[PDB]
Design a protein around this ligand. Structure first.
Ligand SMILES: Nc1ncnc2c1ncn2[C@@H]1O[C@H](COP(=O)(O)OP(=O)(O)NP(=O)(O)O)[C@@H](O)[C@H]1O
Ligand SMILES: [Mg+2]
Ligand SMILES: [Zn+2]
Lengths: 130, 505, 171, 195, 533, 258, 188
């Protein structure tokens, strides 16, 4: 499944990254080895976050209709904004519209009105993955 | 030694559990006991290897991987079952000591051990295997001694002894010298009682991989098989066959002192346990077939239905189709009380223009008759078409091979006069007779002949006599029951119908 | 069993034998004649995505499913004698998918017990050929021609895993 | 029958997936099957015409309770199975294009809707890459950093070029000893090798 | 006694310890072999020499004695790396020592390791040798066993458990065996002294080295050179072998598919056929159709519909050679044939036998005849069956058999025999001096569009992937044209056997596009190209 | 290495026939019909009548086994998983207790016939089933040192028996078997029938018995415990007299032995 | 978005990255104790307060970074010695089902230290390279026995290393999933 976003941790980490970058620039403009350690540590820190966010976006691609259906359910025990970050919300929303426009014009424009829905649960095969 | 008894017990439990084998034992026994009071069925049973798997896996794998230690006790238990069931009293002298137990055979699901002569390998020795191929050679049948009985002149006591050889038993024993004892332990002179002694039949064959599987024009490979008792003479050369048996080795392999420096290998064989043919003709009717056949026969016009169902891909020629159907049914062969014979089988000839489906229609009979041989008229000689000499031995031709069948001859007009006259006997007396250096014999050839030809002028000429168009002697045309002339007459609607038909086809 | 899965899309198109329980006008196009009715006790071969519904919707439903040849008794005996030697690829390209679909449809108990053993026994040799890395081709290639489309994916993702580890270690 | 064209179309999806998976460097997704897709859509239009005619016969009263219900229902299934095939095929080619968009952020094989789709998704990627979270290069390398300094050899004569760390002069078959964090992009572009 | 244990210990420690950089190459190979049930090890001489030269010295002095010790050492290691039963493992060797020419082997080389090369000319069937063997003692009925190994033995005579002079027999029911095979090696053709026929040797291999080569292949061999019993005090030499040396991808069919959608593909293939020959457009078109062929079909009543094509040509020598090169399978012959079988087949003699000519031998492929007028008398009549039926049938001198003749015939010459062919054409010439000068300049150069292999592979791909069917429009068109020509001839012959030829040409034309249906576009070109006259 | 992790009446009879034979040890429970009572008793009675008839005709064990074994599948099945067969066997034995506890002659005849049937069925077992059945009855082997010290006497005692009873004509085979054979030590009075035939070795009042013999101890324990249970059954016959519907059946069953 | 080979698993590079975050003991050849390091994912005091030839503990990636130059020397872990590896092999042979209790990163750390720090061992390195191999071979036998218990419910493993698990992950999970699908389909 897609696990809930750590809202607080990410705020604090990203602020710390910015401050460390400015400190490295100030010391550089001011023995070599401590600078080497600082530079490569910042690389090691940034790699983990990059991998993590790419994985989460990949999960959002695969469960887009499921997340939308979970949000549309007024009786849901959790809101979509609890689960996703603001950037993730933007990506999910606009990517769904792009994909929808592509298939709607290309295929579904030609189908009869009973089969024009994209997120149909009632058909002979369920169109929603989870 | 004690393990042999437990294996006999375990197979007895199997025979009690799966009851369809008891019915088989009992039915063979009661059938043989009935006609004996007036053919006889063999003392052999075929077991499904799947039943044995579901009954006891430890016995199943034992039969299939260590047959020398599991087949003998199982076979012993079968004999005890058949012996305990009721049997006719007061047996004769030969029956009392026949030395004739019952024997097993197998079917179903051999798995990895289903093989071919190319792939049979030294890893498979002493395993139970199934092989497939073509029979290429067969030995003469010979009798073999296994037990002899003797009467002692003074004491009035009957004595006996048993013999063994390496191909007679799955397990291995000290060989026996094939000598008859002349004198008793106590010095009494003995006599041999033939008719109370027991002899069995023996035959060796050879099986080769099918030519369809031969790689790269390489030499083909083959195996020798040993048959005995009931299995003798159930095959002939050219048969496609599937054989079941134990794969085994023999002899001293040159380790008994020899000049070879032991580079030569040991000899090997398959001991025939069961043999099955392959279809590569006959069918057996079920009850439903008899019902359907009898019901269909009461339609008003069965002849039209059946005749039009022959070669539906060929348009027209209704009457020739009807004639072919009547040929396939045939008349009735008569033998009168004074030995005189009256013919029953129908011969048909058809002659006509180019492209008018003569060869195409002739080809259909070859794929619906139960026995059929095909030949072209110029590719065959008179002796090859009837019989020829070799070494003295006399060898059959095509008309002798299709005895109770049909022979198809295409391009009949190209056959030379010297070849045609060999056929005049076969189409009426239905025999072939040879009188050549060192040979005189008669052979049977009862078939029906169907053939196709081209007219003399390349197309049929209505403005000349039929004898001018058909260059064959009157004595030969007389032997064909129906002679059909067919032509390609140009007409609009006929052309349209035929062309649309072949395009739909 | 996802919607957009190509293998599931492709496996649902295999045909199964069927028999009708009502005569119906105009549906002769199933019998490749649009101008005629279907008649009761007619037998036809239909794709599974259609037969799976016509066997259920009513009472008596429109179609009855006949036992297909790929689940015949001969195949079961072949499976139970030696599962490793068996040429499942020739029997049917998508065997373990159709097996699960048929089990769900009829809730078979014994077929599940046969199929579970078949999979478990073939996984062993599949791992053997996955583990064996060169520092051979014929010995491996003879068995890898008898794998299902289902089994090939497991073999590929195993071989790559072992190979990546080996490459990293000896580097 | 109405599913044959779909069963033929999906085989191209399986084929292009295997061709793509075999060689990650050689991505050129093949010609869009405009003609087969057009034939499938024409078949759907034929089925729609048949249902409409059947509705006219239903309003005329032609045994509509059983006959129109069964014929209509059977027709509906034939349309749904065609929708599934078309969506599966288009979804596969979409996944391939999304994969290329992340690295790149030529056109002739893509259908025009796909040609605008790719541009839209590139706009989305650069929107995420900008703004907040800009400090981490979301389109950068996914392999963990092993070493700070490496030796790289000069494979293509791109001449003198500029980069955020400085300027380089790529004299063919010269060799640099330099930090990887700088030359990672040039290695990906293909001017350099690690030796 | 102890030397047998020290040597085994030494080779055991060799396998357990030889690293080159960071991988224990022989431990890894031995483990990876067991997982695929391969019980052997391929050692390399140079590594053995590098590890310890003394071991190699012992091996080089007495190979017959020391090879078995190294084999049992391999077994002892194989158990440790896989068990917390196995046969004895086969040792295999690789070497780079100087090759000896086969003609120079002599009495100085007996019982030495030798490396040589040549051509394999014959292969025996497999035969069985014993390794573990069980014995029964005839008098006391005591039992024992023996372990053979195959290096240069007889049954013993020390009776046990008096017990007699020669009491032992074999229990074949409880013994183990292996495979053995014989081969013949002939010296290299480019080595033989002039005016002499090549010399050859006989040799043996067992277990995994069996069934590894086929006749006619050039090979390199490593083995012990030795003698065996079979003049005075004289013996035959031989060799014991220890080592031997001797469908489409996706990226391929993508090119073939790109060719298939080219709007001028028919022109491209015609242009690619014998490009040096000037003019003769329709000849080239007909050869494309002959190479591509129609589609075979089988009906419910069992009748069978032909797929092949047949063409006749009345300069012409070059095209048959080109067809022979481009075709996936091909046979070339002149009208008299390669033997008394002629083109078709014949019976020969002493018992009689039968052999087939170059119609039976080309079954499944293409055959081309260089002068069809030089056909023999028997072949003149027999080719009718070979072409109409795709069979040859004989019933002569007690032989009674039928032969398959499934092939497409190309023929040339300089009568009624023309009726057998689908198309007939007459070759045409032009006399441009530049053409001859260009040919002459190329001849001097050697004395001082699509390529063939790509086209052959494309033809193979199309034959494997597609077999197209007539559309209804084509059927109406063809039938209307057929009745039109017959009516025109009637008011002034065409026959069904030629309509069924036009259909095959039509299918072959649709096959290039890989279109599953044939269309009026193809029918038009088919009847247009039908103008043989 | 990898690692994972009334009904009572039916279970009772499954337990009682896991060994395939029983000493008939325990009180039955639940219900069966009166027709079943009569028929089951008569079936076992027919088998025991034929056993006593053959013994009165002085036929051997092999002949009696040939005569009686076909009757199990019809009257009283053996080596069977069926709950009905197991209940039929068990209940029929218990019924004939109540029929044949009534007098010393009836008790002796029933004990003799039932013990011989026990012997027959024990012979039908596999050696594994025999071992498991003996072990289930909670039924002293000598040490290897004592066997070695007495090896000459024990081998002299059993060598003829090994040849005639186990067909070991070869002395080599007899020696190998004797090397593998175990021996039991017990007071000589417990195996006195083997003592009178000099089939066991005697030392200091103890008899030394090989493991391939000694089935007479098992059958004698069966006979003795059955006799004691019949004596007990006799003592509480006044409680049987509370259901009149059973007494005619028991009188009929006993009349064939009087 | 994410590569196909990283959908369900970690590559060996990520496994090396994970192992590199552990602490290790070193001897420095320089004194830093009175610029400063100012790290943000670790302690900073240890590196700022080094004294020459005084033992101290730091993360492994910095330790290898120092050992690239003269300024540092790495102490081998105590389990990575001939005596301990002998005892672990004896444990492996004695208990034919249990796995011996080696640390979760033993393979990775051995094959890092043999490359970067071949000079700092006390034992002869050509013996350690043999005993590591013996351990891996015995453990592979035990793994091959265990793959006959894949089932519909669960499995227990003990002391199996991270790299050893990651090697097997895509096989075990896939076959187990399909057995689960086959079983539950019969219930429904
Ligand atoms: N209804 C039909 N009438 C005539 N010919 C047909 C018909 N249907 C198919 N044919 C074709 O006619 C062709 C020639 O048939 P065939 O039987 O060889 O003629 P034929 O009488 O043997 N001519 P020939 O070989 O010159 O003596 C074959 O290719 C058949 O497929
Ligand atoms: Mg013809
Ligand atoms: Zn002896």
């Amino acid at each position: 499944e897609l696990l809930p976003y750590p809202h607080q941790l990410m705020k604090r980490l990203l602020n710390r990254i910015s401050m460390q970058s400015q400190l490295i620039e100030n010391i550089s403009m001011g023995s070599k080895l401590p600078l080497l350690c600082m530079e490569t540590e910042l690389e090691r820190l940034k790699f983990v976050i990059r991998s993590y966010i790419r994985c989460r976006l990949s999960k959002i691609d695969k469960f887009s209709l499921y997340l939308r259906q979970l949000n549309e359910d007024e009786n849901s025990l959790i809101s979509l904004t609890d689960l996703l970050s603001k950037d993730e919300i933007k990506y999910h929303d606009t990517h769904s519209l792009i994909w929808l426009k592509l298939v709607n014009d290309s295929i579904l424009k030609y189908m009869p009105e009973e089969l024009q829905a994209i997120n149909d649960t009632e058909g002979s095969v369920n169109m929603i993955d989870e | 030694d004690a393990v042999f008894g437990d294996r006999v017990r375990r197979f007895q439990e199997f025979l009690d559990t799966f009851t369809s084998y008891r019915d088989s034992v009992r039915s063979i026994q009661v059938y043989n006991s009935n006609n004996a009071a007036n053919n006889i069925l063999p003392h052999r049973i075929i077991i499904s290897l799947d039943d044995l798997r579901e009954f006891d896996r430890s016995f199943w794998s034992g039969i299939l991987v260590e047959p020398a230690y599991f087949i003998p006790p199982a076979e012993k238990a079968l004999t005890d079952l058949a012996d305990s069931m009721d049997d006719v009293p007061h047996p004769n002298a030969s029956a009392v000591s026949s030395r004739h137990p019952w024997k097993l055979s197998f079917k179903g699901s051999f798995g990895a051990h289903a093989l071919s002569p190319r792939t049979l390998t030294a890893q498979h020795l002493n395993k139970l295997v199934s092989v497939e191929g073509i029979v290429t050679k067969t030995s003469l049948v010979r009798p073999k001694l296994i037990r002899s009985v003797h009467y002692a002149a003074k004491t009035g006591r009957f004595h006996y002894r048993d013999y063994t050889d390496a191909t007679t038993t799955l397990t291995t024993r000290i060989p026996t010298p094939a000598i008859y004892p002349t004198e008793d332990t106590e010095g009494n002179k003995l006599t041999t009682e033939y008719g109370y002694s027991t002899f069995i039949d023996h035959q060796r064959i050879t099986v080769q991989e099918m030519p369809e599987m031969a790689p790269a024009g390489q030499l083909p490979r083959s195996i020798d098989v040993i048959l005995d008792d009931d299995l003798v003479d159930k095959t002939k050369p050219g048969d496609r066959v599937n054989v079941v048996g134990v794969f085994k080795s023999l002899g001293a392999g040159g380790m008994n002192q020899s000049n070879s420096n032991t580079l030569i290998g040991f000899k090997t064989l398959i001991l025939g346990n069961t043999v099955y043919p392959l279809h590569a003709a006959r069918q057996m009717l079920t009850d439903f077939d008899i019902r359907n056949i009898n019901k269909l026969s009461k339609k008003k016009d069965i002849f039209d239905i059946l005749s039009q169902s022959l070669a539906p891909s060929i348009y027209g020629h209704d009457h020739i189709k009807k004639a072919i159907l009547l040929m396939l049914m045939g008349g009735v062969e008569k033998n009168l009380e004074n030995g005189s014979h009256l013919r029953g089988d129908i011969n048909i000839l058809m002659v006509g223009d180019p492209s008018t489906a003569k060869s195409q229609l002739l080809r259909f009979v070859l794929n619906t008759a139960s026995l059929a041989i095909a030949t072209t008229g110029r590719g065959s000689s008179g002796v090859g078409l009837t019989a020829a000499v070799t070494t003295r031995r006399l060898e059959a031709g095509a008309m002798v091979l299709a005895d109770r069948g049909v022979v198809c001859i295409d391009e009949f007009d190209k056959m030379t006069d010297v070849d045609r006259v060999a056929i005049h006997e076969v189409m009426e007396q239905q025999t072939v007779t040879i009188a050549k250096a060192g040979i005189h014999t008669t052979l049977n050839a009862r078939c029906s002949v169907i053939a196709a030809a081209n007219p003399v002028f390349g197309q049929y000429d209505v403005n000349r006599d039929p004898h001018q168009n058909i260059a064959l002697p009157d004595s030969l045309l007389s032997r064909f029951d129906l002679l059909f002339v067919v032509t390609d007459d140009i007409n609009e609607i006929r052309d349209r119908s035929i062309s649309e038909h072949v395009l739909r086809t | 069993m996802g919607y957009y899965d190509i293998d599931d899309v492709l496996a649902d198109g295999t045909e199964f034998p069927c028999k009708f329980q009502y005569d119906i006008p105009g549906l002769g196009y199933l019998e490749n004649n649009p101008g005629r009715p279907i008649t009761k006790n007619t037998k036809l071969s239909l794709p599974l995505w259609l037969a799976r519904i016509l066997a259920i919707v009513g009472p008596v439903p429109f179609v009855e499913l006949l036992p297909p040849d790929m689940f015949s008794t001969k195949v079961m005996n072949a499976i139970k004698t030696d599962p490793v030697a068996l040429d499942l690829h020739s029997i049917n390209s998508h065997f373990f998918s159709l097996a699960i679909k048929w089990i769900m449809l009829f809730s078979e108990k014994e077929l599940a017990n046969v199929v579970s053993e078949l999979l478990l026994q073939r996984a062993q040799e599949l791992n053997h050929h996955a583990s064996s890395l060169s520092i051979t081709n014929i010995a491996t290639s003879t068995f890898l021609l008898k794998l299902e489309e289902m089994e090939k994916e497991i073999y590929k993702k195993s071989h790559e895993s072992y190979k990546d580890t080996k490459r990293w270690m000896f580097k | 029958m109405y599913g044959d064209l779909g069963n033929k179309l999906v085989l191209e999806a399986k084929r292009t997936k295997q061709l793509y998976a075999r060689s990650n460097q050689d991505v050129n997704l093949p010609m869009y099957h405009e003609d087969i897709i057009r034939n499938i859509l024409k078949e759907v239009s034929n089925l729609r015409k048949n249902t409409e005619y059947l509705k006219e016969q239903q309003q005329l009263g032609m045994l509509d309770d059983k006959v129109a219900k069964c014929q209509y229902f059977v027709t509906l299934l034939c349309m749904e199975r065609n929708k599934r095939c078309l969506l599966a095929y288009q979804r596969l080619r979409t996944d391939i294009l999304d994969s290329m968009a992340w690295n790149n952020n030529d056109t002739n094989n893509l259908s025009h809707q796909e040609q605008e789709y790719l541009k839209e998704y590139c706009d989305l990627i650069t929107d995420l890459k900008s703004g907040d979270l800009v400090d981490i290069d979301l389109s950068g390398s996914l392999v963990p950093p092993s070493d700070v300094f490496i030796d790289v050899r000069v494979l293509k004569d791109a001449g003198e070029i500029q980069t955020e760390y400085g300027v380089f002069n790529l004299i063919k078959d010269s060799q640099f000893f330099v930090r990887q964090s700088d030359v990672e992009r040039l290695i990906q572009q293909g001017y350099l090798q690690k030796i | 006694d102890d030397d047998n244990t020290e040597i085994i210990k030494s080779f055991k420690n060799f396998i357990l310890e030889f690293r080159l950089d960071s991988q224990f190459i022989y431990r890894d190979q031995l483990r990876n072999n067991i997982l695929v049930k391969n019980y052997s090890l391929t050692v390399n001489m140079e590594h053995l020499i590098g590890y310890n030269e003394d071991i190699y010295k012992k091996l080089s002095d007495e190979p017959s004695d020391i090879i078995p010790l190294f084999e049992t050492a391999i077994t002892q290691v194989a158990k440790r790396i896989s068990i917390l039963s196995l046969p004895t493992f086969q040792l295999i060797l690789n070497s780079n020592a100087n090759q000896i020419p086969l003609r120079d082997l002599d009495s100085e080389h007996v019982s030495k390791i030798v490396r040589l090369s040549g051509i394999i000319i014959s292969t025996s069937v497999l035969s069985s040798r014993a390794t573990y063997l069980s014995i029964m003692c005839r008098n006391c009925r005591h039992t024992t066993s023996i372990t053979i190994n195959n290096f240069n033995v007889s049954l013993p005579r020390s009776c046990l458990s008096n017990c007699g002079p020669d009491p032992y027999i074999i229990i074949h029911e409880s013994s183990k065996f292996i495979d053995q095979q014989f081969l013949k090696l002939q010296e290299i053709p480019e080595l033989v002294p002039v005016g002499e026929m090549p010399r050859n040797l006989t040799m043996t291999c067992d277990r995994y080295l069996t069934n590894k080569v086929i006749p006619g292949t050039r090979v390199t061999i490593v083995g012990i050179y030795s003698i065996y019993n079979s003049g005075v005090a004289i013996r035959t030499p031989y060799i014991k072998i220890l080592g031997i040396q001797s469908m489409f991808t996706e990226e391929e069919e993508e090119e073939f598919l790109q060719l298939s959608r080219n709007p001028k593909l028919y022109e491209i293939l015609t242009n690619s056929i014998a490009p040096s020959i000037f003019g003769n457009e329709d000849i080239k078109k007909a050869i494309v159709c002959l190479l591509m062929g129609g589609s075979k079909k089988i009906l419910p009543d069992g009748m069978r519909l032909r797929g092949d094509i047949n063409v006749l040509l009345l300069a012409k020598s070059q095209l048959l050679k080109f067809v022979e090169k481009v075709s996936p399978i091909a046979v070339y012959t002149s009208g008299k044939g390669s033997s008394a079988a002629g083109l078709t087949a014949s019976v020969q003699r002493r018992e009689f036998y039968l052999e087939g000519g170059a119609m039976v031998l080309a079954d499944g492929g293409v055959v081309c005849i260089d002068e069809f007028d030089k056909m023999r008398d028997e072949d003149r009549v027999a080719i009718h069956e070979a072409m109409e039926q795709q069979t040859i049938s004989i019933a002569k001198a007690g032989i009674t058999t039928v032969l398959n003749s499934r092939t497409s015939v190309l023929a040339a010459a300089n009568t009624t025999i023309l009726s057998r062919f689908d198309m007939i054409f007459i070759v045409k010439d032009d006399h441009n001096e530049e053409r001859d000068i260009s040919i002459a300049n190329h001849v001097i150069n050697i004395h001082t569009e699509i390529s063939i292999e790509k086209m052959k592979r494309y033809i193979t791909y199309c034959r494997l992937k597609c077999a197209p069917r007539l559309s209804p429009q084509a059927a109406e068109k063809l039938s209307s044209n057929f009745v039109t020509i017959r009516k025109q001839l009637l008011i002034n012959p065409i026959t069904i056997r030629q309509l069924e030829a036009i259909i095959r040409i039509t299918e072959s034309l649709a096959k290039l596009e890989l279109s599953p249906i044939a269309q009026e576009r193809h029918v038009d070109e088919a009847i247009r190209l039908f103008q043989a006259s | 290495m990898f690692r994972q992790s009334s009904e009572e009446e039916k279970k009772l009879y499954a337990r009682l026939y896991e060994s395939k034979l029983s000493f008939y040890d325990l009180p039955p429970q639940g219900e069966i019909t009166l027709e079943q009572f009569e028929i089951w008793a008569i079936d076992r009675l027919k088998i025991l009548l034929e056993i006593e008839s053959c013994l009165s005709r002085n036929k051997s064990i092999k002949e009696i086994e040939t005569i009686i074994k076909p009757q199990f599948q019809k009257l009283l099945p053996f080596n069977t998983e069926s709950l009905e067969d197991r209940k039929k066997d068990y209940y029929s034995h218990f019924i004939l207790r109540l029929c044949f506890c009534r007098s010393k002659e009836l008790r002796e005849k029933f004990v003799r016939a039932e013990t011989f049937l026990f012997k027959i069925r024990f012979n039908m077992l596999t050696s594994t089933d025999q071992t498991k059945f003996v072990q289930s009855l909670d039924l002293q082997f000598i040490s290897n040192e004592e066997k070695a010290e007495l090896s000459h006497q024990l081998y002299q005692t059993v060598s003829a028996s090994l040849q005639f009873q186990l067909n070991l004509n070869e002395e080599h085979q007899r020696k190998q078997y004797f090397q593998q054979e175990k021996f039991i030590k017990l007071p000589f009075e417990n195996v006195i029938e083997l003592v009178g035939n000099r089939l066991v070795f005697l030392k200091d009042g103890y008899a030394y018995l090989p493991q391939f013999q000694q089935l007479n101890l098992l059958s004698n324990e069966f006979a003795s415990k059955l006799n004691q249970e019949l004596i007990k059954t006799y003592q509480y016959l006044p409680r049987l007299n509370e259901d009149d519907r059973l007494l005619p059946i028991l009188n009929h069953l006993s009349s064939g032995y009087t | 978005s994410l590569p196909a080979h990283l959908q369900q698993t970690f590559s060996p590079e990520e496994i090396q990255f994970i192992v590199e975050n552990e602490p290790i003991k070193i001897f420095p050849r320089i004194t830093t104790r009175q610029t400063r390091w100012q790290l943000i994912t670790t302690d900073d005091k240890a590196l700022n307060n080094m004294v020459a030839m005084r033992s101290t503990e730091v993360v492994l990636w910095i330790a290898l970074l120092l050992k690239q130059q003269s300024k540092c020397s790495i102490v081998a872990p105590q389990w990575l010695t001939t005596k301990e590896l002998d005892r672990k092999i004896q444990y492996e042979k004695t208990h034919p089902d249990r796995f011996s209790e080696l640390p979760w990163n033993w393979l990775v750390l051995a094959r890092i230290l043999f490359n970067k720090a071949k000079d700092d061992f006390h034992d002869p390195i050509h013996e350690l390279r043999g005993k590591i191999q013996d351990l891996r071979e015995i453990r592979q036998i035990k793994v091959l026995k265990g793959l006959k218990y894949l089932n519909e419910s669960h499995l227990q493993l003990d002391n199996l290393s991270l790299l050893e698990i990651n090697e097997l992950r895509p096989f075990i999970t896939e076959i187990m999933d399909k057995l689960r699908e086959i079983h539950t389909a019969s219930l429904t």
